[PDB]
Amino acid sequence: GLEKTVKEKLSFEGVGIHTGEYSKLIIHPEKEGTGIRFFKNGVYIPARHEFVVHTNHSTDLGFKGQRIKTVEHILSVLHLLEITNVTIEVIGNEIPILDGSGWEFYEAIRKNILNQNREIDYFVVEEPIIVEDEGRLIKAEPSDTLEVTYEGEFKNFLGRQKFTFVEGNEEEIVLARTFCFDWEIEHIKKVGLGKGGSLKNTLVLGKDKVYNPEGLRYENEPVRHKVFDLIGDLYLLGSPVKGKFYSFRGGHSLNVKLVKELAKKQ
Numbered sequence: 001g002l003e004k005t006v007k008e009k010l011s012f013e014g015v016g017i018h019t020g021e022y023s024k025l026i027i028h029p030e031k032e033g034t035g036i037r038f039f040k041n042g043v044y045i046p047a048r049h050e051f052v053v054h055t056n057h058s059t060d061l062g063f064k065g066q067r068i069k070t071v072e073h074i075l076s077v078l079h080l081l082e083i084t085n086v087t088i089e090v091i092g093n094e095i096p097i098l099d100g101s102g103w104e105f106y107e108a109i110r111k112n113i114l115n116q117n118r119e120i121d122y123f124v125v126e127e128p129i130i131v132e133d134e135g136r137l138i139k140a141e142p143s144d145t146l147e148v149t150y151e152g153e154f155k156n157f158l159g160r161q162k163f164t165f166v167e168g169n170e171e172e173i174v175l176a177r178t179f180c181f182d183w184e185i186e187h188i189k190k191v192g193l194g195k196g197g198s199l200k201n202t203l204v205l206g207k208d209k210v211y212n213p214e215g216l217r218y219e220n221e222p223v224r225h226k227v228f229d230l231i232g233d234l235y236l237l238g239s240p241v242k243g244k245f246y247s248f249r250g251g252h253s254l255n256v257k258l259v260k261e262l263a264k265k266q
């Protein structure tokens with residue numbers, strides 16, 4: 001595939017799910033070999049694992065005293081579309097959550113793709129690797145195409161479910177929204193997070209219920225979302241990725257752990 005940028009500057013704005021503050025994004029075109037980077041208060045923050053500063057409830061980056069929260073969704077959409085050269089200017093402290101999915105970013109960026117004059121240098125998984133953390137596991141192995149499976153095991157009605165993304169099925173995961181359980185709200189608010197959360201940008205699930213009046217988009221919308229998150233975190237390898245991945249109960253922390261182990265090995 002050829003390296004790609006955007007045809008023109010694209011803008012997005014809205015509340016950050018964790019800060020509860022308004023922020024604005026400006027996606028700038030960039031030349032071949034630039035890579036994906038964020039820009040905030042005069043500092044460039046590359047979208048790479050060396051710049052990850054926090055992973056508990058979002059994937060956050062920082063450099064030289066400047067931090068940006070919740071990069072997982074914009075990075076997943078850029079990865080899915082193979083956008084390789086772009087500057088994401090952030091006026092604020094977090095990426096806007098919008099409806100909690102990648103839909104708005106995906107629809108706008110997909111209509112503005114500009115192919116460039118280089119073949120993409122893919123990050124190619126060369127051998128099998130397994131990373132683990134207290135009941136959670138992620139396996140990666142060689143593959144000519146990006147294939148990502150997430151298997152969840154939930155304490156509520158969702159039970160045990162899995163979903164697999166393969167290239168060409170981007171539309172199956174870009175609408176899946178972020179979610180949380182009603183029993184998690186206390187903790188998230190207590191640690192100074194979830195300030196912008198509402199039923200308009202997060203699915204809220206209970207032991208037997210879906211609080212959002214619209215309900216779920218898909219019966220397995222939560223696992224489709226976890227696949228979407230893993231594809232965003234994999235872009236921290238700094239190039240579009242080719243490999244077959246299987247995550248059992250993974251989250252941003254384990255995804256970043258896998259990315260760092262893959263980067264170290266290769």
Ligand SMILES: CCCCCCCCCCC[C@@H](O)CC(=O)O[C@@H]1[C@@H](N)[C@@H](OP(=O)(O)OP(=O)(O)OC[C@H]2O[C@@H](n3ccc(=O)[nH]c3=O)[C@H](O)[C@@H]2O)O[C@H](CO)[C@H]1O
Nearest residue numbers: 056057058152153154179180194197198199249250251252
């Ligand atoms: C008007 C009133 C409205 C009320 C609404 C406002 C409430 C406050 C706003 C909340 C906003 C946040 O909700 C945003 C936020 O944090 O969104 C995160 C997102 N970033 C990503 O976070 P992360 O990847 O780090 O998540 P974990 O993997 O760690 O899972 C998390 C827990 O699920 C367990 N788990 C996991 C997998 C499994 O198979 N089984 C199982 O049990 C696991 O053990 C752990 O206890 O995905 C999470 C989902 O999974 C989202 O919640």
Ligand SMILES: [Cl-]
Nearest residue numbers: 056057187191
């Ligand atoms: Cl925390």
Ligand SMILES: [Zn+2]
Nearest residue numbers: 001002119120
């Ligand atoms: Zn090619």
Ligand SMILES: [Zn+2]
Nearest residue numbers: 056057187191
């Ligand atoms: Zn926490």
Ligand SMILES: [Zn+2]
Nearest residue numbers: 057058059072
């Ligand atoms: Zn997240």
Ligand SMILES: [Zn+2]
Nearest residue numbers: 072178225229
């Ligand atoms: Zn997410």
